[PDB]
Amino acid sequence: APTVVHETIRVPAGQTFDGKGQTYVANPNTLGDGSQAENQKPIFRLEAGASLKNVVIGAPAADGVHCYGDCTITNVIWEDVGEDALTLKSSGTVNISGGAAYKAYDKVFQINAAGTINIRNFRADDIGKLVRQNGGTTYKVVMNVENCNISRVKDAILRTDSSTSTGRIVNTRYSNVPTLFKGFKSGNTTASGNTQY
């Protein structure tokens, strides 16, 4: 059944939360409405090495998923991204495979610590950017996109301000995307097997 989430669901270190394909929305009074209003609460808080899987986040999506360290996100669908889809709050590696993200006013993925994010076999439509490293920071984030299909991007698929962050987009279909990468020093971008459509 759709659950209205009132308080953030914590997923302890190394554990999985399987939503079994069920929908989870935020309570707008306790977590946030999914607007651009700053610092809304995550619907899911993942501890290091935790996994979230087979979950549908519906609107109001507040500030989606935060990961404190490594997290694997498998077949999770953001039907309408709130403030952000998933944020990396502490250093680590985010791995996404499968799922989808729609209607993100600005970013789907926000990386707020040094780390990696691999996004595989993901559908994302009508978004500002797929991954933004927190603005101005100069720590290294490795951004990697494989076998995705990304469309109607306001700004860029991958965006950074750090001269050590790397961006890799491989075998991805994309449409109405202004730039693939934005802000990387020359030599810090890789791309192959992509298709503009």
For residue 84, CA distances in Å to 53, 60, 77, 170 come to 18, 12, 13, 24
Q: Report whether 125 belongs to an annotated binding site.
A: no
**Which of residues 102 and 184 has its CB atom nearest to Ca ion in the complex?**
102
Q: Report whether 63 belongs to an annotated binding site.
A: no
> What is the Rg, in whole angstroms, of the alpha carbon atoms belonging to the chain?
15
Q: What is the rounded CA–CA span in Å between residue 51 and residue 96?
A: 10
Number of residues in contact with Ca ion under rule CB under 5 A: 3
Least CB distance from residue 80 to Ca ion, whole Å? Answer: 5
Q: Does residue 103 interact with Ca ion by CB under 5 A?
A: yes
* CA-wise closest residue to 140 among 166, 117, 102: 166
Q: Which stretch binds Ca ion (CB under 5 A): 44-52, 72-80, 129-137, 177-185?
A: 72-80
Q: Report whether 81 belongs to an annotated binding site.
A: yes
The correct pick among 80, 116, 124, 160 for binding Ca ion (CB under 5 A) is: 80
Task: Please provide residue 167's backbone torsions phi and psi, each rounded to the nearest 5 degrees.
Answer: -130, 135
Q: What is the rounded CA–CA span in Å between residue 163 and residue 20?
A: 40
**Which of residues 103 and 129 has its CB atom nearest to Ca ion in the complex?**
103
Binding residues: 80-81, 103
Interface residues toward Ca ion, by CB under 5 A: 80-81, 103
Binding residues for Ca(2+): 80-81, 103
